[PDB]
Amino acid sequence: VNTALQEVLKTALIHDGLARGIREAAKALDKRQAHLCVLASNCDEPMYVKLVEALCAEHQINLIKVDDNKKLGEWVGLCKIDREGKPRKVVGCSCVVVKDYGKESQAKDVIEEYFKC
């Protein structure tokens, strides 16, 4: 059901709601704007992954745990060179805190339904 997360990712870039990056996450989590956060795994971030899980566990913050950093960078699309073909060289992002302003979408409802169960 990750194609729904890709639709919410698109609506958060187009309306430009996602305040991505762990420094901007620390700001957005402290200023209480967050609804959904996506996070990579199985990388050399031993105490760092404990920090972001503790910040997400502070007050009313959701979690998506993908395993790859580079695939998360590919999804958000930070270095999409030659879209007509394959992207050349994209960076591996960790913590992207999305906040859809234009929530009128087919995807936000089914992800909220997943978080309700």
Binding site: A26, M47, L51, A54, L55, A57
Partner: protein
């Protein structure tokens, strides 16, 4: 052409890899221990942290100073 005095260099930015972890302290449980002072300015609510220098505190963009 040739000059007398040796050249002046530019200030190189002392860039830090993972500068976010230093600002907080992770607990054994799912809570936090916020080390550095939060900015009491109107522009930035409670998200922006102040500097922790050796003898006073400072915030960057609102440019607010507090001596002991």
């Amino acid at each position: 052409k040739s000059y007398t005095t040796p050249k002046k260099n530019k200030h190189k930015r002392k860039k830090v890899k993972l500068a976010v972890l230093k600002y907080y302290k992770v607990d054994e449980n799912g809570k936090i221990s916020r080390l550095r002072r939060e900015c009491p300015s109107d522009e930035c609510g409670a998200g922006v942290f102040m500097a922790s220098h050796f003898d006073r505190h400072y915030c960057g963009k609102c440019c607010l100073t507090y001596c002991f």
